[PDB]
């Protein structure tokens with residue numbers, strides 16, 4: 247059950263009251279992950295439903311589901327009783343505050359065997375302990391989080407959440423040195439539960455970030471559950487309340503220093519600030535840049551999303567040069583990876599950028615340039631950024647177990663090259679890093695673009 251100083255903050259009657267509860271918990275050495283995830287999940291569950299003076303409020307209504315101590319305490323007790331009842335700590339000797347792999351596996355198995363047998367893996371709003379207790383449903387990373395929360399409930403202070411850019415697992419033991427898979431990844435893959443992440447680090451997949459993944463402390467685990475808030479009511483509509491809650495909570499974490507080592511949280515906060523700026527706060531650009539700095543400082547500059555977030559912002563704001571520079575930087579990070587069979591999410595992002603986002607942005611620039619009959623299409627550095635993007639993709643492909651490029655990429659390459667005049671392309675002086683680009687260096691800058699030669703080269707077996 248809950249401590250006395252946890253109870254006095256209830257009932258929660260607004261967003262600010264939730265924020266106050268997080269502020270109180272984050273002031274402790276062990277914020278209570280269970281309590282906090284239960285609260286977020288309760289609030290999400292009830293806010294993420296569709297639902298002379300005007301007959302109805304003319305701007306609609308905002309809502310809050312009051313959260314009574316009696317409701318939240320009961321859910322909390324059900325979780326802690328289930329985990330405590332299922333794990334007998336006397337059977338798992340525990341010297342030095344290090345958990346054994348056997349204990350971690352047992353706690354993992356308790357969570358996993360509790361889950362409903364059939365539900366869509368990509369279902370919204372099943373990320374929190376609320377969903378686990380009240381619906382026995384958790385999404386992939388929600389399983390990992392729940393394992394960590396269960397470990398906290400058992401007093402296992404060394405078990406922590408590990409995150410890549412697309413997967414989650416647990417770390418434990420003397421220095422966070424041990425690792426265990428506890429959940430599934432993607433669709434129709436074969437599961438590795440109970441295994442270490444060593445094969446994934448060695449393979450140099452994006453999915454394991456070559457070992458430069460996030461090893462959370464308790465305050466970062468709080469930051470994760472905040473990032474996991476899902477404001478979506480449906481495809482075309484968001485809860486403003488849940489956007490505000492996530493935004494306010496991320497500022498609280500930011501002020502406390504808890505996003506220092508969390509690039510993706512800083513991108514998420516930048517995106518929210520663009521949508522609804524908070525008076526007196528840093529602008530979105532400052533925050534995207536802080537996320538890149540965090541990745542450079544703590545993660546060897548081996549993350550992709552810090553640069554994708556920045557590129558997205560520039561793209562949405564029609565800053566053609568800056569967007570291309572940021573995508574060039576994303577490719578410069580990916581080139582030092584091998585493309586592996588569970589990296590499909592970042593393949594999809596590169597694909598989309600090369601075959602949809604860049605072509606649209608350059609088409610918009612071309613309309614601007616026509617109307618004015620300087621443009622980014624007249625800037626050789628823009629062209630050089632486009633080339634660096636493709637060069638990094640070709641270099642990513644090199645030595646990978648799955649090919650990346652195929653004929654479907656070639657038509658959009660040719661069209662994007664053609665957006666820049668010969669005289670502009672010919673100003674550049676660059677030595678490519680990939681074999682594929684080196685083998686067409688003359689074609690890329692020739693006055694007449696030879697599509698079929700560029701296609702052959704781009705699709706050559708690497």
Ligand SMILES: CC(C)N(C(=O)c1cc(F)ccc1Oc1cncnc1N1CC2(CCN(C[C@H]3CC[C@H](NS(C)(=O)=O)CC3)CC2)C1)C(C)C
Pocket residue numbers: 373386387409410411412413414470473474510511514551554555557558559561595599603
């Ligand atoms: C928070 C967590 C539950 N989420 C994860 O996807 C996640 C799960 C993991 F196990 C391990 C990592 C995970 O990712 C994150 C962990 N912590 C914070 N944020 C995360 N993510 C933000 C993320 C999704 C949204 N994109 C948005 C971004 C916008 C601009 C776009 N730029 S572009 C392509 O237009 O040029 C790239 C995509 C960034 C990455 C994943 C949710 C977002 C579903």
